[PDB]
């Protein structure tokens, strides 16, 4: 293996792959534990590295090499006397899981060998390697599933504590199954998350939630809107967008599942923002978040602003992506509008109309399209011909820095006297980077929604909302780091405070 099972099995406890109690197999893995004590010993000799990584890969992996100046070759001859004693039929194989969380815990010295080897890569499914693999099937208990109809006695399905481990999908408490049917001689794998399948529009849909099934009140047949606020924080859809998710989707099957490890890169860009929050060397920390319209980002960042407020204790501002859009509709005629912070927060309320929605309503009436069905009926060429006209009404506001121009809007708001020190600003597309400012942090935010279905769901704006979504989506390639909402809440727990 890469990571050594024997020194610390707790990592493979997370995947639910347990060592067999203790044959060629058992004698083999004890050899691998000796090699990792050896490779760690050579590590410290030269700044934590190896010396001839292609020379070690020939000895350990292929087994075709025998070694007999003393200064440079002393480490190799010590390796050769060890491996030659094993009398193996062939060389040992290197193994690596597909999961990035497994890769982030691999020792530095193993990575040096990997480039001169051909590692056997075990594919995962949802953060879980398939158990049919040749190596995992020999070294670890093969997990056995127990469902509704599948529940039975051990005698009906021949099983031993040696060979097999039990997974519980029945949904009854594990203490009952362990105590009632005599399964206390087997070890149960445990899963702290959930994998919930939903009925979608286009087809069946799956999902992953970072919360335990007891803490999530959803059961079979539940409505999507019930407990919707919990899913938006901790859920991840795992199907290609667009999905089938709707306001009226229902649950089919719910099972315990492994927790999703937060992305290593997404935590890095967010902690870069938190480093600017704590230190006094920076005057303004400002996070920028883009999302496709209709993702509900304003619903999530209203709470994420409060969670950050409890930590640092500073008053955190918040500006919805339509804050400038409504404020431009009010003060376009007034010559010297107020830029005071709380006055702009007063105009962020949903009841007011954005300026951009007004100009887009005329552009649809100019072709006479007020119906969702008439808009869906159009060819892609007919829509793209219109979105170029919407690009003209947008460049008019970004072209220059004027008193009513958008760049001066975020300048006077950010540099106002009473404005909060830390801000959280939303934006609709990448081209707004020059306007909203001035930051080293920017992230995309992917909720669990079909935003093009969510726009058809809402009945107020109708076509004007769905049309602006595609006009923003056309100008918003995913060129910045992606961030699911749970990783932002995970970002705050890991960072130390004070």
């Amino acid at each position: 293996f890469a990571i050594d099972p024997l020194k610390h099995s707790k990592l493979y406890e997370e995947y639910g792959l347990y060592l067999r109690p203790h044959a060629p197999t058992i004698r083999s893995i004890k050899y691998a534990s000796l090699i990792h004590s050896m490779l760690a010993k050579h590590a410290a000799r030269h700044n934590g590295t190896l010396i001839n990584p292609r020379m070690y890969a020939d000895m350990i992996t292929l087994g075709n090499t025998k070694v007999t100046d003393i200064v440079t070759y002393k480490a190799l001859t010590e390796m050769s006397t060890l491996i030659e004693s094993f009398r193996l039929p062939s060389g040992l194989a290197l193994i690596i899981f597909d999961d990035e969380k497994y890769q982030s815990l691999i020792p530095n010295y193993i990575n040096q060998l990997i480039a001169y080897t051909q590692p056997h890569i075990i594919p995962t499914w949802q953060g879980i390697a398939d158990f049919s693999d040749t190596y995992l099937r020999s070294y670890f208990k093969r997990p056995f599933e127990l469902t509704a109809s599948n529940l039975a006695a051990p005698q009906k399905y021949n099983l031993s504590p040696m060979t097999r481990s039990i997974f519980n999908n029945t949904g009854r408490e594990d203490a009952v199954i362990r105590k009632l049917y005599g399964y206390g001689e087997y070890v149960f794998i445990r899963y702290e998350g959930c994998l919930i399948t939903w009925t979608g529009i286009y087809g069946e849909v799956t999902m992953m939630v970072n919360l335990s099934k007891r803490d999530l009140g959803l059961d079979v047949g539940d409505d999507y809107l019930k407990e919707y606020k919990k899913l938006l924080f901790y859920g991840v859809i795992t199907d290609a967008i667009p999905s089938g998710i709707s306001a009226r989707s229902t649950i089919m099957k719910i099972s315990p599942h492994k927790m999703m490890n937060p992305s290593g890169g997404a935590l890095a860009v967010l902690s870069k923002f938190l480093e600017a929050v704590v230190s006094t060397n920076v005057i303004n920390a400002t996070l920028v978040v883009y999302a496709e319209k209709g993702a509900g980002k304003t619903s999530f960042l209203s709470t994420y602003a409060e969670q950050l407020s409890l930590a640092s204790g500073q008053v955190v501002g918040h500006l919805s992506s339509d804050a400038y859009g409504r404020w431009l509709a009010k003060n376009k005629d007034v010559e010297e509008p107020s830029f005071a912070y709380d006055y702009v927060l007063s105009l962020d309320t949903d009841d007011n109309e954005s300026y951009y929605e007004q100009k887009a309503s005329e552009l649809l009436i100019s072709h006479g399209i007020s119906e969702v069905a008439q808009y869906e009926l159009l060819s892609v060429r007919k829509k793209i011909k219109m979105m170029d006209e919407m690009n003209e009404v947008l460049i008019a506001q970004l072209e220059n820095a004027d008193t009513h121009s958008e760049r001066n809007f975020y300048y006077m708001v950010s540099t106002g006297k009473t404005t909060p020190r830390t801000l959280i600003v939303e934006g609709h597309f990448n081209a707004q980077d020059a306007t909203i400012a001035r930051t080293d942090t920017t992230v995309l935010l992917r909720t669990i929604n079909d935003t093009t279905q969510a726009m058809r769901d809402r009945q107020r704006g109708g076509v004007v909302q769905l049309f602006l979504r595609d006009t923003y989506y056309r100008l918003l390639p995913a060129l910045h780091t992606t961030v699911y909402p749970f990783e932002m809440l995970e970002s705050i727990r890991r960072w130390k405070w004070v």
Binding site: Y202, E376, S379, V380, D470, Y473
Partner: peptide, 21 residues
Amino acid sequence: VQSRTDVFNEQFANEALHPMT
């Protein structure tokens, strides 16, 4: 009735490869 295809992103990809006139 609706299809994976009417979505704008889907329509656009297609437009990516049987580009019509």
